[PDB]
């Protein structure tokens, strides 16, 4: 039982790690777009700061 | 603030200043000034007369 549950937790953690990698890629794209909007002059610095957080 | 948020507010301020300028012109008309220098004649209308 312990070996089975440990292998299942490993597989579940690997899948959740892939999904958090996708979340990090999405947040990187969104932060780059807000950085472009702030560098152009349309968005203020506060909208950049919240995307940074 | 973003520079667009400064630019449109500056544009609204300039528009309100131009409206103040036009109201100042209409206030300058009601004290009617002589457009040239020279000899004046008679006043064909006196005080109390309505003009359009």
> Which residue of chain B has the CA closest to A46?
B1
> Which residue of chain A has the CA closest to B4?
A42
Round to whole Å and give the CA distance between A30 and A32: 5
Shortest Cα distance from B6 to chain A (angstroms)? 10
Structure tokens given for B45: 């209308």
With DSSP H G I counted as helix, E B as strand and the rest as coil, what are the percentages for chain A, rounded to 5?
90, 0, 10
Structure tokens given for A35: 């950085």
Round to whole Å and give the CA distance between B18 and B24: 10
Round to whole Å and give the CA distance between A21 and B27: 69
**Cβ neighbours of residue A48 under 8 Å, at least 6 residues apart?**
A31, A34, A35, A38
Deposited experimental method? cryo-EM
Structure tokens given for A27: 């947040």
**Cβ neighbours of residue A47 under 8 Å, at least 6 residues apart?**
A34, A37, A38
A2-40 helix and A45-52 helix, angle to the nearest 10 degrees: 170
Q: Residues of B with CB below 8 A from A44's CB?
A: 1-2, 5
- Is A42 close to B1, i.e. CB distance below 8 A? no
Round to whole Å and give the CA distance between A26 and A46: 20
Q: To what resolution in angstroms was this structure determined?
A: 3.2
């Amino acid at each position: 039982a312990s070996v089975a549950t440990a292998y299942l937790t490993l597989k579940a953690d690997q899948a959740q790690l892939q999904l958090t990698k996708d979340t990090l890629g999405t947040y990187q794209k969104s932060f780059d777009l807000t950085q472009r909007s702030y560098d152009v002059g349309v968005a203020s610095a506060l909208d950049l700061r919240q995307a940074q957080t | 603030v973003s520079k667009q948020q400064y630019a449109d507010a500056n544009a609204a301020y300039l528009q309100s200043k131009a409206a103040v300028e036009q109201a100042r012109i209409n206030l300058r008309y009601t004290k009617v000034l002589s457009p040239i220098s020279g000899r004046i004649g008679r006043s064909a209308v006196t005080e109390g007369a309505l003009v359009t």
